[PDB]
């Protein structure tokens, strides 16, 4: 279901919709979430009303949480970019009492308004982070900001740098990740100088988050292009050797080692394209990557954001 959903994404081919429907209805805790994800992939951006009404039904009433924890992505992914047209869905999801659907609403409002800082989107998304009772949705809320801000990196430090001091660690991890994902392509001189104390926070997994964000923001910088590359190099090199530092921290260091030298240095992220348009496959890849918190083998989806960094000449079609 993973392979087929990826390879046929966005086609809205009917046969795969059929087969994934019948695979979900089994109500099994290891099939139904993968079917949900694959369905989201193939149904990409269709805003298909009957399919949505179909797939919300099972999610309204099931015993197994895994399926909900999968479909929470799919019901956002089907809804890409329609902006206010999706509002009717939003006004339902944020009304739900089940925490997983409230969590999904965040991803949905994020994916509906990508690249545009619509005032009501930022207002509601920021509001819910301050006031919800469940920490996972409080994370996902601030996590969503990066998608709706990324066209104006100079803005985010004006807001995330306050919330980075939240007492509870979930909000700190969320804000650090939102910053790291939003500006990720540019070695911004300001944002980086927030992350050093985060790299020394007593909570281990927020340090993991901070290391990931740091290694992401810098992907092709050099010591002349920003004055910090060697610092983070040697930080990774020490913490990966240290025999006493925590697991679920140095895991982040290993991933940093990989990402910073990914693809022979010949690659970078492209969530903004040089034509001025947004580039869906990198958006999907990075969103699915952020879910590694729940299920490790999704990390491969990060590869969908890599793009070559070259110029090539041609004289004839051959």
């Amino acid at each position: 279901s993973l392979g087929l959903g990826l390879a046929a994404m966005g086609t809205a081919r009917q046969d795969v919709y059929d087969l994934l429907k019948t695979n979900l209805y089994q109500d099994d805790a290891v099939t139904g979430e993968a079917a949900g994800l694959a369905l989201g992939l193939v149904m990409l951006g269709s805003k298909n009303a009957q399919a949505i009404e179909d797939m919300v039904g099972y999610a309204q009433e099931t015993q197994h949480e895994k399926i909900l924890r999968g479909l929470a992505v799919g019901i956002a992914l089907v809804m890409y970019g329609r902006m206010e047209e999706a509002d009717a869905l939003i006004e339902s999801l944020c009304r739900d009492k089940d925490p997983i659907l409230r969590r999904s609403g965040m991803y949905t409002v994020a994916m509906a308004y990508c690249g545009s800082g619509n005032n009501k989107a930022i207002r509601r998304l920021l509001h819910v982070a301050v006031s919800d009772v469940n920490d996972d949705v409080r994370r996902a809320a601030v996590e969503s900001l990066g998608f709706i801000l990324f066209r104006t990196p100079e803005q985010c430090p004006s807001v995330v740098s306050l919330l980075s001091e939240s007492y509870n660690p979930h909000v700190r991890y969320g804000a650090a990740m939102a910053l790291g994902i939003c500006c990720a392509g540019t070695g911004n001189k300001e944002a980086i100088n927030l992350l050093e104390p985060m790299t020394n926070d007593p909570v281990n997994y927020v340090r993991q988050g901070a290391l990931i964000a740091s290694a992401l923001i810098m992907i092709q910088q050099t010591e002349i292009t920003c004055p910090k590359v060697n610092q983070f190099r040697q930080l990774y090199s020490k913490v990966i050797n240290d025999k006493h530092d925590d697991v679920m921290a140095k895991f982040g260091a290993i991933l940093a080692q990989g990402i910073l030298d990914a693809g022979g240095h010949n690659v970078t992220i492209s969530l903004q394209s040089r034509t001025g348009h947004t580039h869906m496959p990198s958006v999907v890849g990075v969103l699915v990557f952020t879910q590694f918190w729940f299920w490790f083998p999704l990390s491969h989806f990060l590869s969908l954001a890599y793009t070559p960094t070259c110029v090539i000449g041609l004289n004839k079609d051959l």
């Binding site: 015993q63 679920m248 590694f292 729940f294 083998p297």
Partner: protein, 287 residues
């Protein structure tokens, strides 16, 4: 193989039952049995719990006779609740949470009868107004470390969100058994009816507080306001004649007029406002 994501769901009713039973046997280690269902290989629900009769050794307890539970496990099915048993619990008062060297033995046979079994432990005297100290454990076979493997092959972050206490880790813990995360199953209806706790009769809201004692209370409070006001200006004059570093010490032995004054203003205003509003509402709503 086992994993690092398994999740235990407990209802409110099991919680209140366990707290009450554990607190009643406060000097000793009481016992009980818990029942529910394995909805899947990743999650387990416990729905209800019932106590058990014991003869107590000084250190611990043993279940006196099994005829009791053999009766109970069919006595109640005449009224629904057909669930099978899934685990047991005992309470450590103030010690902390761990499995003793014999609790482990008792868990051995529970697991041998069903490999998914669980053990639960609670602390009824350290738990206060929140943060009720509950934990869940399961044994691990030393065979796996003889191979040099480790249990609980891992695929997810969500198991590592908490750290064990030093006291729990001095005892066996990871070298003998491993913990499982817990969460609370709820529904809106029971919440909607539980919050009625300390609601009160409507009539209580419309009482006039015995107009003869009210003035006595008022012009009792005013007297100590007098005697404090005459002691305030000394501490105002001494504001700066000494090193401020020791000024904290100037508080410690001797009550200060400023902080101790304003609580009387709080009392007086809070009383005299509502006493006056209620009289107006009465003098309008009746005739």
């Amino acid at each position: 193989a086992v994993d690092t994501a398994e999740q235990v769901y407990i209802s409110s009713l099991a919680l209140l039952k366990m707290l009450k039973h554990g607190r009643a046997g406060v000097p000793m280690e009481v016992m009980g049995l818990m029942l529910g269902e394995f909805v899947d290989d990743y999650t387990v629900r416990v729905i209800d719990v019932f106590a058990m009769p014991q003869s107590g050794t000084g250190v611990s307890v043993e279940a006196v006779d099994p005829v009791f539970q053999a009766k109970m496990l069919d006595m109640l099915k005449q009224t629904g609740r057909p669930e099978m048993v899934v685990g047991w619990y005992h309470s450590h008062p103030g010690f902390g949470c761990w499995l003793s060297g014999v609790d482990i033995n008792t868990q051995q046979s529970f697991e041998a009868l069903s490999e998914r079994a669980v053990a639960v432990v609670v602390d009824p005297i350290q738990s206060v107004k929140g943060k009720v100290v509950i934990d869940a454990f399961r044994l691990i076979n030393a065979n796996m470390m003889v191979l040099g493997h480790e249990p609980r092959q891992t695929t997810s972050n969500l198991g590592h969100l908490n750290k064990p206490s030093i006291q729990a880790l001095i005892h066996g813990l990871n070298r003998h058994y491993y913990s499982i995360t817990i969460n609370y199953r709820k529904n809106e209806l029971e919440q909607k009816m539980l919050l009625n706790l300390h609601k009160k009769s409507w009539m209580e809201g419309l009482t006039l507080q015995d107009y003869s004692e009210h003035c006595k209370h008022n012009e009792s409070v005013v007297k100590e306001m007098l005697e404090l006001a005459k002691n305030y200006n000394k501490a105002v004059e001494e504001e700066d004649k000494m090193t401020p570093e020791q000024l904290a010490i100037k508080n410690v032995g001797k009550q200060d007029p400023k902080r101790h004054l304003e609580e009387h203003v709080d009392v007086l205003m809070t009383s005299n406002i509502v006493q006056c509003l209620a009289a107006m509402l009465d003098t309008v709503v009746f005739k």
